[PDB]
Design a protein around this nucleic acid. Structure first.
Ligand SMILES: [Zn+2]
Ligand SMILES: [Zn+2]
Lengths: 51, 73, 51, 320, 472, 30
RNA sequence: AAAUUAUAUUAUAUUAUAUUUAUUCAUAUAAUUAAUAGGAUAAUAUUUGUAGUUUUUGAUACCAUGAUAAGGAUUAUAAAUUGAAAGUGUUAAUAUCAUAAUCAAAAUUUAUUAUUUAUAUUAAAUAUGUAUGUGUAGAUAAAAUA
């Protein structure tokens, strides 16, 4: 089990770095600029009384 | 984050955790005529779903402006 | 889900006589509907231990 | 078994036989090595002023026996039918008895006789390192030497497959290797004798020492070359596979003829009844008890008396 | 018992019959003939309308809007030569205005011949529609679009007769006509597609016309069809930096089509994941079309580093298809709005990689596995790929044996069993008893039995030694 | 005959049987 | 007649003398045979008392095993360590049913005046005289008539 946990952790490290880099390249595009979703804007203005 | 989202003032959104177990055999019960009832035994033995929620997440404002969970709540 | 798919297929290249099980703790939005489950007063005739 | 050609693969009777014999597996389970559990020790069978016979029964899962003759004077020992799943008790016995192993007698070269032969020669030569051990055998068994691998195929003896047999190496009867001028552990084995089928009571013997003579007798039927040992001074007949307790050898194997087995049983009638016959398999008997109580010899002599010109006797189920 | 293989997959049915593939090919051929018949009927109706308006109305001059609608319907069906004298007469009569020129130039891109080339010729590949529409007179329709652009600019300079030295270049009509010119030049051959960001964009800059979002989207689509991805990503980075509230899904479709054409499929996955993350602008069925076609193009791609030693490697990317389809069910993109060829490939990858819980309880029965074996044995010549043929960073001098007491905790059962006669001169070093060194389950009893047997044979050997050496 | 436990328990060779043989769905029931 | 090998610790036992019970034993019994068959989200087979009948449960022997007891030698020249403890050889007696033609002891279940050993019940008796085992057991923390 110790030699398997070295085989799987090395596998999930290279896979998990590739997936997070795919999410980091999308987040840095979402921070450069984007248009606000009208359904997202409607979710904030949904309550009757605010704070 | 999956799950439905309520926009009406009578629908509160609770961010909650769900814990569950997936188990599939790959050594002996991977396939043969026993594989069905063994997989059903593994699934029904792992039937537990743990639904967790912080009370601090419940202390937000509702759609009507009043707080959802106060001190006495 | 790309990582959950890649995590589930570790079971196909495991070691000899070595199996695995998976645990997943994810966040999921829950709606408490105040119309299906309303907050009402106590009834006039209350319930007892005989119920 | 045999080579899977096109006709054997397109036959449904082959799959029917492999289902009937072995069930749903279809593959025969081999003859495995006896483990270190359920293994007995070496017994001293006979003690005499001339020789000592030390043996071990059921040393294989073929249910064969392993015997060694010890000369009390010259301190020389002689293994006959060297097939033991553990030839480490025998090397320790030889080393603790201060004995020298000089030859190994082979009755015939079936797999129940030569399975651990390279192990015997290697371990006993390694103990001699702290002149090599010769092999005495009949050249007709050459046809059973070449099928040692195939017999190791069918009986599951995979670790003894890729082993050059010492009877196949170059002896003094063979041409020599012309090696490059710029080794002799395997290139030439000077200690090797080939027994002749013309066996007589005059000169067909081995001088074991101290006036003890071992007359080898050519007796086919279970093999093309099958050599019994006869010691008339000790009344001991190492029969090998020709004669057992209440039964004789098989003929339902290749190069085995029933009338050769009948002639081999007929050339045994001049020995006295108190000669202890020592078989390759099972319990030992006497030749008088086999003249009185063995049905194969009764059938052989009855067919000879009623007038059969070609008397054919032999077992079809028994010891290999 | 003989062991079963745990790295061999469960035998399951993932494939179609020869009859089902033949019926799929037959039905797709019938749909292609139906689309060809529809386009030929519509083109015959348009030509009959033109012959009626040219024969019966020989001297009666038609109203200008009937001739404008006839020229639009002629140019939309790929009949550009029958429409240009109508446009010359309408421009000579000064009946055309700002919107009518853009309507004519947009009709010159032929969006009725494009539907036939889509459904019949290109096999519903939307990049192949741009690649195949350049064959039906790309250079001549490009020259007519340039001529109608010059006609439009002359009529815009007429119609604008303060901002006097900055007209009509500052108006919305000039930008609309330039967008129509770019949209028509995308339809033509490769020279005009390459000239859209080269010559047309520099001419629009030198003329002083302010672009719109469709201008940048058509320039990005031209760079996508060229295969130049760094410039298209630069244009979308410019749009993300400055005018971010105006970006529509056509720029994402341009990047998806371009990274599909440049065969950089990881960028296609990155763009699709970004579009799922932001959820605005909404994903059209063209987004799912381009992304699933990029997936099918990457999965059918052969590799050369393992040199096909066991099987094809990229087929596992079809396992991404049951994920992304579920994302479409979250994105509101209907999966029935996919083309029939792509739906065939998606159902292929779905029956290769998808199972439900009810099938997963029954798919490993021995009946189905042995039926798989019997079907491979009987007719495997029909379906087989081969039958066709401390902390280490602060550690430098490691402290050893730091008085950690191993006698407080309990590890007393450390017994080991060694073979008898390791240094004995009578017991040989090499032997079959070396195989006793690898045995774990019954180790103690095997070592005791071997030691007892070796002691007994050594005692018997020395006893026979003493008896023989004392008897003589 | 077996695999020893001190040996590395790696996968010996991968098996691509479902991608070499694509089987159509065939059940005895309609 | 020394050195100590020695384990040592404490308790029990019987037809007093008769009665109920856990097992044992007696005599009544029930139970019997064989072989597969895929069903929602799958591009179309309607299907399963169908292909099985003279089906399998059938070789306990006289092999050369192995346990028992007994004697040998090597190491301590240190006051440190939680801890100065570990490996290597010979003789007597006892004993040896596996290459063959079967079948239900306690394979095995259940019950009745009846056979035991145990289970607890179980008492009178000073006229005189009086009643000593081998063993079975639990964890194991004293020592000189040879
Ligand atoms: Zn033989
Ligand atoms: Zn033999």
């Amino acid at each position: 089990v110790m030699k398997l946990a070295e085989d799987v952790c090395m596998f999930l490290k290279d896979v998990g770095r590739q997936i997070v880099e795919e999410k980091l390249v999308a987040v840095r595009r979402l921070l450069q600029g984007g248009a606000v979703d009208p359904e997202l804007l409607a979710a904030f203005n949904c309550a009757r009384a605010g704070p | 984050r999956i799950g439905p989202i309520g926009l009406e003032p009578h629908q509160f959104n609770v961010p909650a955790e769900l814990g569950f177990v997936e188990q599939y055999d790959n050594l002996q019960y991977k396939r043969y005529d026993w594989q069905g009832w063994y997989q059903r035994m593994l699934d029904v033995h792992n039937r537990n779903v743990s639904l967790r929620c912080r009370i601090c997440d419940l202390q937000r404002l509702d759609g009507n402006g009043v707080q959802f969970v106060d001190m006495q709540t | 889900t790309e990582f959950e798919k890649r995590m589930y297929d570790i079971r196909h290249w495991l070691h000899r006589q070595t199996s695995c099980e998976f645990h997943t703790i994810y966040r999921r939005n829950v709606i408490h509907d105040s119309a299906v489950f309303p907050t009402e007063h106590d009834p006039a005739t209350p319930t007892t231990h005989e119920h | 078994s045999y080579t899977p050609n096109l006709t054997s693969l397109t036959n449904q009777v082959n799959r029917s036989e492999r289902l009937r014999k072995w069930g749903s597996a279809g593959v025969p389970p081999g003859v495995p090595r006896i483990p270190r559990l359920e293994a007995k020790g070496i017994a001293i069978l006979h003690e005499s002023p001339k020789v000592i016979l030390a043996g071990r029964s059921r040393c294989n899962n073929f249910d064969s026996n392993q015997y060694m003759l010890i000369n009390k004077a010259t301190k020389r020992c002689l293994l006959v039918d060297a097939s033991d799943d553990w030839p480490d008790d025998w090397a320790a016995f030889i080393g603790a008895s201060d004995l020298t192993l000089t030859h190994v007698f082979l009755t015939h070269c079936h797999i129940d006789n030569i399975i651990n032969l390279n192990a015997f020669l290697t371990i006993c030569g390694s103990r001699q390192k702290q002149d090599e051990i010769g092999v005495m055998w009949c050249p007709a068994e050459e046809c059973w030497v070449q099928n040692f691998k195939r017999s190791c195929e069918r009986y599951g003896r995979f670790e003894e497959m890729h082993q050059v047999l010492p009877m196949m190496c170059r002896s003094l009867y063979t041409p020599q290797h012309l090696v490059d001028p710029v080794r002799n552990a395997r290139h030439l084995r000077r200690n090797d004798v080939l027994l002749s089928a013309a066996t007589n009571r005059a000169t067909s013997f081995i001088d074991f020492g101290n006036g003890v003579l071992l007359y080898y007798i050519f007796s086919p039927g279970h093999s093309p070359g099958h050599m019994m040992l006869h010691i008339p001074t000790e009344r001991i007949l190492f029969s090998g596979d020709l004669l057992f307790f209440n039964k004789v050898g098989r003929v339902d194997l290749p190069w085995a003829t029933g009338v050769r087995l009948a002639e081999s049983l007929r050339l045994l009638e001049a020995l006295p009844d108190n000669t202890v016959v020592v078989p390759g398999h099972g319990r030992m008997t006497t030749l008088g008890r086999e003249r009185r109580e063995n049905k194969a010899l009764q059938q052989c002599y009855q067919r000879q008396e009623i007038g059969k010109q070609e008397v054919s006797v032999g077992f079809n189920e028994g010891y290999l | 018992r003989k062991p079963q293989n745990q790295w061999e997959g469960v035998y399951y049915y993932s494939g179609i019959t020869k009859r089902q593939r033949h019926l799929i090919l037959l039905h797709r051929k019938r749909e292609r003939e139906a689309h060809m018949r529809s386009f030929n009927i519509s083109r015959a109706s348009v030509l009959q309308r033109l012959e009626q308006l040219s024969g019966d109305r020989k001297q009666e001059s038609l109203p200008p809007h009937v001739r404008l609608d006839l020229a639009v319907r002629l140019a939309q069906h790929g009949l550009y030569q029958q429409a240009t004298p109508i446009v010359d007469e309408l421009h000579h009569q000064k009946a055309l205005h700002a919107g009518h020129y853009a309507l004519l130039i947009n009709a010159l891109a032929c969006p009725r011949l494009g539907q036939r080339i889509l459904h019949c010729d290109a096999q519903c590949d939307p990049a192949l529609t741009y690649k195949l529409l350049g064959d039906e007179n790309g250079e001549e329709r490009a020259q007519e679009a340039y001529r109608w652009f010059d006609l439009a600019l002359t009529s815009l300079a007429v119609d604008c007769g303060h901002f006097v030295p900055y007209l009509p270049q500052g108006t919305a009509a000039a930008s609309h006509i330039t967008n129509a010119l770019m949209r028509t030049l995308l339809t033509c051959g490769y020279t005009h597609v390459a000239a859209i960001p080269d010559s047309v964009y520099d001419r629009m800059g030198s003329m002083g016309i302010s672009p719109t979002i469709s201008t940048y989207e058509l320039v990005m689509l031209a760079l996508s069809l060229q295969g130049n991805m760094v410039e298209a990503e630069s244009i979308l980075s410019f749009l993300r930096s400055h005018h971010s509230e105006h970006i529509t899904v056509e720029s994402f479709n341009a990047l998806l089509l371009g990274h599909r054409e440049a065969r950089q499929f990881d960028c296609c996955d990155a763009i699709w994941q970004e579009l799922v993350d932001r959820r605005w602008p909404r994903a059209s069925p063209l987004t799912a079309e381009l992304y699933l076609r990029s997936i099918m193009d990457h999965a059918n791609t052969p590799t050369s580093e393992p040199l096909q030693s066991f099987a094809n490697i990229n087929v596992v990317e079809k396992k991404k298809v049951p994920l992304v389809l579920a994302q479409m069910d979250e994105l509101g993109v209907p999966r029935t709005h996919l083309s029939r060829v792509l739906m065939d490939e998606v159902e292929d990858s779905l029956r290769k990689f998808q199972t439900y819980r009810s099938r997963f309880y029954e798919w490993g029965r021995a009946v189905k596995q042995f039926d798989f074996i019997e079907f491979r044995r009987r007719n495997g010549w029909l379906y087989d790929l081969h039958l066709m043929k401390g902390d280490i960073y602060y550690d430098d001098t490691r402290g050893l044996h730091d008085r950690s007491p191993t006698w407080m905790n309990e590890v007393p059962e450390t017994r080991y069993d060694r073979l008898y006669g390791v240094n004995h001169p009578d017991i040989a070093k090499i032997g079959i008893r070396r195989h006793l060194n690898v045995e774990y389950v019954n180790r103690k009893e095997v070592v005791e039995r071997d030691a007892a047997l070796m002691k007994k044979t050594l005692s018997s050997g020395r006893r026979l030694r003493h008896r023989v050496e004392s008897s003589r | 005959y077996h695999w020893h436990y001190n040996l590395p328990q790696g996968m010996e060779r991968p098996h691509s049987v479902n991608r070499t043989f694509a089987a159509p769905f065939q059940s005895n029931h309609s």
